[PDB]
Amino acid sequence: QIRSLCELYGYWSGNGYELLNNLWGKDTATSGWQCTYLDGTNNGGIQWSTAWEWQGAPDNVKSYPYVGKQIQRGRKISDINSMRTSVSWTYDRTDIRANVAYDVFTARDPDHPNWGGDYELMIWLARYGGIYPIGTFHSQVNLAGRTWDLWTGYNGNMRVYSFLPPSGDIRDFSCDIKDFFNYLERNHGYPAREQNLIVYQVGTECFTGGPARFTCRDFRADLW
Numbered sequence: 001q002i003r004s005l006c007e008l009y010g011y012w013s014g015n016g017y018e019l020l021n022n023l024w025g026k027d028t029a030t031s032g033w034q035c036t037y038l039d040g041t042n043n044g045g046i047q048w049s050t051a052w053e054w055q056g057a058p059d060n061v062k063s064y065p066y067v068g069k070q071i072q073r074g075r076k077i078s079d080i081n082s083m084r085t086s087v088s089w090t091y092d093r094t095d096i097r098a099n100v101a102y103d104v105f106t107a108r109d110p111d112h113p114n115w116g117g118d119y120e121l122m123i124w125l126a127r128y129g130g131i132y133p134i135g136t137f138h139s140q141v142n143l144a145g146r147t148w149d150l151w152t153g154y155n156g157n158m159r160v161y162s163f164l165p166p167s168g169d170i171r172d173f174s175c176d177i178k179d180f181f182n183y184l185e186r187n188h189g190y191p192a193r194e195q196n197l198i199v200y201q202v203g204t205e206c207f208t209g210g211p212a213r214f215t216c217r218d219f220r221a222d223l224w
Ligand SMILES: OC[C@H]1O[C@@H](O[C@H]2[C@H](O)[C@@H](O)[C@H](O[C@@H]3[C@@H](O)[C@H](O[C@H]4[C@H](O)[C@@H](O)[C@H](O)O[C@@H]4CO)O[C@H](CO)[C@H]3O)O[C@@H]2CO)[C@H](O)[C@@H](O)[C@@H]1O
Pocket: 009, 011, 020, 022, 024, 061, 063, 064, 103, 114, 115, 116, 120, 134, 155, 160, 205
């Protein structure tokens, strides 16, 4: 690895991306730890991984290590033209409680801290070990050439929209996240003209299990 980010909130940034050992829920674990590794910054993308083992509190997320696209504040979603992104990943085992997911926060306040927002949009690419998304299953949605199960609910005051694969995982994925925002704006009244982009990330929520390793073979994200 080029960098080993094993401290709580170990951080790297470069090439318009950032990488965080985001062990935000670690105090709910009885034992374990996790490290996030920068493997490369080749070809306008990021190559990274995270190794972990967590025990205790199986319904509690211990971490969401991620790679994020750095963004300027104040980009109203309505005026974002495109958010084209691709990811190729693997997990070394699937007998774990964990996901792989894009995470996007938006807020009316353009300076909202990156830990949350008024709304959250997740695009899940894996669902391992019987974990649940936020909220309840709403309906199926056709976007990005796939069918998704849309779940909706609340995490505190934040409205959360999660798009899940009906079955299996998606280890090689590309989409334009604006298609997902457009679907929510039209059919769910999502206030895109009032909402500012806060974060734009992909990573793995880790609940329990391991030793396990998530490898991101490549991540690219653009914003126009
Ligand atoms: O940016 C560098 C600084 O990082 C600071 O740590 C922050 C971190 O940047 C931020 O990304 C993190 O946010 C977490 C967030 O990932 C998580 O998201 C949940 C979401 O709430 C939930 O609805 C959904 O189901 O899952 C998501 C993924 O798990 O939410 C939690 C709690 O709300 C956020 O905290 O927060 C970190 C701090 O907790 C460092 O503090 C700083 O030192 C460093 O410079």
